[PDB]
């Protein structure tokens, strides 16, 4: 088992920031009014954008064949964010109905999937770094 040095690994750092943001959304979805919904989702969105940008900076230096899989995980993150947004809307619309719990529950699930798929990106990026490491 061989871990990577993450001292200046900005992708690693951004994934962590993103996960911390989902954990926050997770722990405070209870003490939040229908207005606080957009706040926590936005925070997740902003840290996602930062993560994806750091990956884009990286992409040109790793071999061209890793770009397929990695762009694949990036698109999966968009789809996950779009889903978190749909579930935010449903929660705002069912704010005073009896489907409020089910909506916020689906919000936690969607953000959860986003965090896990951010990890999937990191593994695809680590795998590309390490493949290329023994290329030449």
């Amino acid at each position: 088992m061989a871990n990577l040095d993450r001292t200046d690994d900005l992708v690693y750092l951004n994934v962590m920031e993103l996960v911390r943001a989902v954990l926050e959304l997770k722990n405070e979805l209870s003490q939040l009014p229908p207005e606080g919904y957009v706040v926590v989702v936005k925070n997740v969105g902003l840290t996602l954008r930062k993560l994806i940008g750091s990956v884009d900076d990286l992409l040109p230096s790793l071999p061209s064949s890793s770009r397929t899989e990695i762009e694949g995980t990036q698109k999966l993150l968009n789809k996950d964010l779009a889903e978190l947004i749909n579930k935010m809307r449903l929660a705002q619309q069912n704010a005073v109905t009896s489907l409020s719990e089910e909506a916020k529950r689906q919000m936690l699930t969607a953000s959860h999937t986003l965090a896990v798929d951010a990890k999937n990106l990191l593994d695809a990026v680590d795998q590309a770094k390490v493949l290329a490491n023994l290329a030449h």
Partner: peptide, 13 residues
């Protein structure tokens, strides 16, 4: 970054 930013916008509305 394109689709992502479109989402970050729809989120501003």
């Amino acid at each position: 970054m394109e689709e992502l930013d479109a989402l970050l916008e729809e989120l501003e509305r």
